[PDB]
Amino acid sequence: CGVPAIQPVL
Amino acid sequence: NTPDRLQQASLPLLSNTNCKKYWGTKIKDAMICAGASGVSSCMGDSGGPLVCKKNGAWTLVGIVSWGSSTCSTSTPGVYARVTALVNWVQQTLAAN
Amino acid sequence: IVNGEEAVPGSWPWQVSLQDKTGFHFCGGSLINENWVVTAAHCGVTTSDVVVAGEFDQGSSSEKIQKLKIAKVFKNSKYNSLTINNDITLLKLSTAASFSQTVSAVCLPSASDDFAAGTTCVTTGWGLTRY
Ligand SMILES: CC(C)C[C@@H](N)C(=O)N[C@@H](Cc1ccccc1)C(=O)NCc1ccc(F)cc1
Ligand SMILES: CC(C)C[C@@H](N)C(=O)N[C@@H](Cc1ccccc1)C(=O)NCc1ccc(F)cc1
Numbered sequence: 001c002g003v004p005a006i007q008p009v010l
Numbered sequence: 011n012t013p014d015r016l017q018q019a020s021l022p023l024l025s026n027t028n029c030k031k032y033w034g035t036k037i038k039d040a041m042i043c044a045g046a047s048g049v050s051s052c053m054g055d056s057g058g059p060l061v062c063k064k065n066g067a068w069t070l071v072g073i074v075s076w077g078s079s080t081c082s083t084s085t086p087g088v089y090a091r092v093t094a095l096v097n098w099v100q101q102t103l104a105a106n
Numbered sequence: 107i108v109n110g111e112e113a114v115p116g117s118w119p120w121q122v123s124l125q126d127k128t129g130f131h132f133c134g135g136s137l138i139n140e141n142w143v144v145t146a147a148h149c150g151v152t153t154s155d156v157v158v159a160g161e162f163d164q165g166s167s168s169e170k171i172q173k174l175k176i177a178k179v180f181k182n183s184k185y186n187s188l189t190i191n192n193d194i195t196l197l198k199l200s201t202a203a204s205f206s207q208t209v210s211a212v213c214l215p216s217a218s219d220d221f222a223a224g225t226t227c228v229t230t231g232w233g234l235t236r237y
Contacts, residue, residue: 001138002067002213005206008117010020010228011234012131014165016121018230019110025223038191040184044227049109055233057124057145058134061212062227069213070136071221073146074229075193081108081237087229090146090193093215095182100214102180102196103142 012054019049023062023071024086032086042072042091045083052081060089107233115162116208118230123158124151131164134231136212140202147185147195151176157199160209164232172209175200 021044029043037043044060045051051058051074060072072089092099122143124133135145135157143157157174177200184192203209221227 001211002061002069004068004117004119004210006114006116006119006208008018008228009114010018012164012232013235014232015163016113016115016118016161016230016232017107017110017235018113018118018228019107020226020228023221023223023225023227028223036189038189040192042221044229049107051229051231052108052234052237054131054133055107055229055231056133057149058229058231058233059118059121059136059212060227060229062221062225064213064215064219064221067213068228069215069219070138070144071215071227072229073136073144073194074134074231074233075146075148076190081234083109088190089229092194093217093219093221095192095194096214096217098182098184098194099138099144099196103139106178106180106198 021045021047021049029086040091040094042089043086046086048083050081050083051087107231119208119210120212121230123161125156125158127154131232139211141199143197145195146193147181148193151179159203172203174203
């Protein structure tokens, strides 16, 4: 869980 | 008029003691505050996630619950504190 | 979210939208697994509402979204509507979500996990951007 395939960019 | 596209925002967590300076006795143990940093959750964000990265994984720390009636960015939003509710989640999933 | 920013499409894969039968977004939620969504008890979800997963732009017709029906609504018995305490509801899906690059689960914390004041975290959603 908790590891997006598409990385969030903050 | 909610936006069409998904929005995001980073914000700091506050302690319940400090949050009480804003909300008084409305702050209970199963609540966690965040914000008062120039951004704010608002109507329509309810139920959504407040996540913090722990050991590389995004973990659900809060659920958008309530806050300023005007979504004031200088007032902290209040979220349901997941650590205080996870035992119930685990029980419900294991029984249904 | 007031003063937020548009997210990279699909980067918050657990984020779902709760929409009524008319297509009106009224609340957000998070997928904790293929069959369960966690949201706020005050959202007042019924079995006639729909869980939309994999969505980014609610005005787009070309997104391959998943419209999931809700089988049961589990409002925490400790929820107190007067004080808004224990504001959590679990929704068991009738049809399981299909995990993919844009749809997956967020982790749950251990009851003893500590998240210190000052820590910078993230909140997402389709709530008002201006009040
Ligand atoms: C005591 C509440 C009525 C206070 C109200 N300002 C509020 O935040 N209401 C909730 C809705 C609600 C109804 C019934 C019980 C509990 C809550 C809301 O708008 N929640 C969404 C939200 C989140 C953060 C904000 F800063 C502003 C609005
Ligand atoms: C109901 C459980 C099956 C939920 C499970 N998907 C989950 O969120 N697991 C957490 C741990 C947990 C277990 C049971 C109840 C609540 C939380 C996890 O893997 N969290 C991420 C993580 C990463 C590295 C570690 F060393 C430990 C945990």
